[PDB]
Amino acid sequence: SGIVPTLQNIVATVTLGCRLDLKTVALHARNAEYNPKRFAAVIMRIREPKTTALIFASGKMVVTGAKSEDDSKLASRKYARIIQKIGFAAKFTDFKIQNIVGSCDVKFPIRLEGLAFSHGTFSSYEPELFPGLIYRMVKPKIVLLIFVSGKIVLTGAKQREEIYQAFEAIYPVLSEFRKM
Amino acid sequence: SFNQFVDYTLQDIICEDSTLILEQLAQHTTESDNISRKYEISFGKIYVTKPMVNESDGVTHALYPQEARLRNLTYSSGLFVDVKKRTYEAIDELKYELGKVFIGRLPIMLRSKNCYLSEATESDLYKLKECP
Amino acid sequence: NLNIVLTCPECKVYPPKIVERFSEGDVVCALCGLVLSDKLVDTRSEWRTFEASNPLLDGNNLSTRIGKGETTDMRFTKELNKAQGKNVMDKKDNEVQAAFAKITMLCDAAELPKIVKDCAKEAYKLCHDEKTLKGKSMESIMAASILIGCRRAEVARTFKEIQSLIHVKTKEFGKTLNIMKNGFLKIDTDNMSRFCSHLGLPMQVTTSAEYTAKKCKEIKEIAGKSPITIAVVSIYLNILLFQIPITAAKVGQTLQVTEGTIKSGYKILYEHRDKLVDPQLIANGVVSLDNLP
């Protein structure tokens, strides 16, 4: 294909192994918002790497927004370090990436309804609901959002390799339905 | 006979029982109780179009006796009645206040007032593929 | 094992039609030219209204409902109408029946066609069973049997308008649109009939809107626009170029879109207006005069 999808977002979970007083975290950490009435967790953001963590009373958290596996682990470590610095027996445990999202640009337009009619068992296209075509790939198990513009969204991957393999697999069919 | 029924009889049938009311009187415990209401539904003037037909593709248009006989349709016109919906309310004796609807298709008798062929001249009927 | 055959016997061919005859019957082969039984079964002679039954859900029986003027039911009417009203509580009698009675009330009120109006209600009884991510709301899957029920002809829809009617047009309608696909895409000239009928325009305007919209697409003038939008747009070009015009608020209102949106596609196709019309199109107002928008 000659193109390599760009990783745009990585979601990871981390068990800090120790109960937390969310009310206290929200009070001593900067850039933290806590509104239990709507979500039972403290939302905290940091600038390097630019990410957002969801911290729970159970001591477990979700780190989002990271653009690489390293930034994800690194950011996760900083959040844990803050929880500690606040006064908890937090530890960096069970780090695990749960989802990777990537995007592409094949540069050419795509006749989506032709692609949907051709691959009916994998794609759901109804512009009324959503402008992009939803392609549910089997191997690897990656969901793609194909747009008329040639823009491609790939998600559902746990290894960055799946995004790459998903894109290579779809390129031929994308090319086949190129508007030209 | 038919004309008398369309011009007069029809209205009087809409006006005999006509209006129907439903009253919702509360438990008088405390808010949100202790609220007694009475709702009205009234039927006014009755209208009746010239004969029409509602095709499969939404469009409604006039329908002449010949098209009815060939396409096996019904030579009926629309029945429309003015409806009004009032609302009233009291607390734990004093009732205080808080369009044209389609109701059915009535078949027309040929040569009646409502039929197209009533005010029809001889040459008119012939163009309409009817026999004078 | 059930084997049924009419093979002549004398000259087995394995096998050929033997005739149904006209009067004699018995299906004599045009081969051994022998006989087979006596027939004696007139299928044309079915039980008329004058006993036959066309059941679509399970098997219909009926009970009671006495009204023959011989001896008055009075005491016995209530004896049996209560007794049959007790029995419709034993094994989940309610559900399918409630669904089909409430179904004929919601369709009749909007005057949905019986031939295909009833067809979609069979689809609901197939959808109410099976357990595939229904997130069932009763009203939700009813809007599926309101769409396929209107699929007979564009009787009331213009399905978007009947969607805009009442309650739940959004995410819960999305769950339902998916259930039905589990189709063919939906196009410009798909809602043109209905939209135009509710709009009250003539066959003239319909045809031109329908030719404009197809060329809008054929000319790829509206890249990623929703077909409903394109259609409502084209219907605005067409109508505005005729006598019988309708506004974007009037078109949007029936197409189920928003003026803003209709303006968006309209303005995209306007610059090709000339190449979009029918050719033999009339013109109460000409292209050089069409609203630029």
The CATH number that applies at residue A158 is 3.30.310.10
Residues A82 and A106 in one domain: no
Which candidate, C271, C273, C267, C275, places its Cα nearest to that of C287? C273
Find the domain containing A175 and state its range: 1-11+98-180
Interface residue C133 vs chain A (CB under 8 A): no
Based on the fold, state whether residues A92 and A120 are members of the same structural domain. no
- Residue A172 and residue A144 in one domain: yes
Nearest residue to A115 (alpha-carbon basis) of A52, A162, A36, A175: A175
Based on its alpha-carbon atoms, the radius of gyration of chain C, rounded to whole angstroms, reads 29
Return the closest-CA partner of residue C143 out of C114, C118, C122, C172.
C172
Q: How far is B54 from chain C (nearest CA, A)?
A: 8
Distances from the Cα of A80 to the Cα of A27, A29, C51, angstroms: 16, 12, 79
Do A87 and A137 lie in one domain? The reply is no
Quote the CA–CA distance of B20 and C97 in Å, as a whole number.
Answer: 29
**C155–chain B Cβ distance below 8 A for any pair:** yes
CB-nearest partner of C185 from A113, A129, A179: A113
> C224 to chain A: which residues are within 8 Å by CB?
127, 131, 147-149
Q: Which residue of C has its CA nearest to B57?
A: C154
| Same domain flag for A17 and A86 | yes
SS (H, E, C) chain C: CCCCCCCCCCCCCCCCCCCCCCCCCCCCCCCCCCCCCCCCCCCCCCCCCCCCCCCCCCCCCCCCCCCCCCCCCHHHHHHHHHHHHHHCCCCCCCCHHHHHHHHHHHHHHCCCCHHHHCHHHHHHHHHCCCCCCCCCCCHHHHCCCCCCCHHHCCCCCCHHHHHHCCCCCCHHHHHHHHHHHCCCCCCHHHCHHHHHHHHCCCHHHHHHHHHHHHHHHHCCCCCCCCHHHHHHHHHHHHHHCCCCCCCHHHHHHHHCCCHHHHHHHHHHHHHHHHHHCCCCCCCCCCHHHCCCC
Q: Residues 6 or more apart from C131 whose CB is under 8 A from it?
A: none
Interface test with C, best of A113, A122, A126 (most C CBs within 10 A): A126
**Of B84, B91, B87, B102, which Cα lies nearest the Cα of B43?**
B84
Q: Are residues A129 and A144 in the same domain?
A: yes
Cβ-based contacts of A126 with chain C (< 8 Å): 177, 181, 186
Whether A106 and A134 share a structural domain: yes
Please identify, in words, the CATH class of the domain defined by C194-271: mainly alpha
Give A42's contacts (C-beta < 8 A, 6+ positions apart). A22, A25, A26, A29, A32, A33, A34, A54, A55
User: Is B60 in CB contact (< 8 Å) with chain C?
Assistant: yes
| Domain edge (last residue) among A64, A97, A130 | A97
* Neighbouring C-beta atoms of residue C123, cutoff 10 Å: 17
A114 token code pair: 């032709």
CA-CA distance, B42 to B85, in Å (whole number)?
6
With tokens 């006993």, the residue in question is C51
Q: What is the resolution of this structure in A?
A: 6.0
Give the residue from A65, A97, A129 where a domain finishes: A97
Structure token pair of residue B24:
């919702």
Quote the tokens at residue B127. 């163009």
Residues 6+ apart with CB under 8 A from C222: C216, C229, C230, C233, C265, C268, C269
The shortest C-alpha distance from C73 to chain A (Å) reads: 58
Domain count, chain A: 2
Chain B neighbors (3+ CB pairs < 8 Å): C
Question: From C153, which residue of chain B is nearest by alpha-carbon distance?
Answer: B56
Query: Same structural domain for residues A78 and A133?
Result: no
Residues A146 and A87 in one domain: no
CA–CA distance, B55 with B38 (Å, rounded to integer): 41
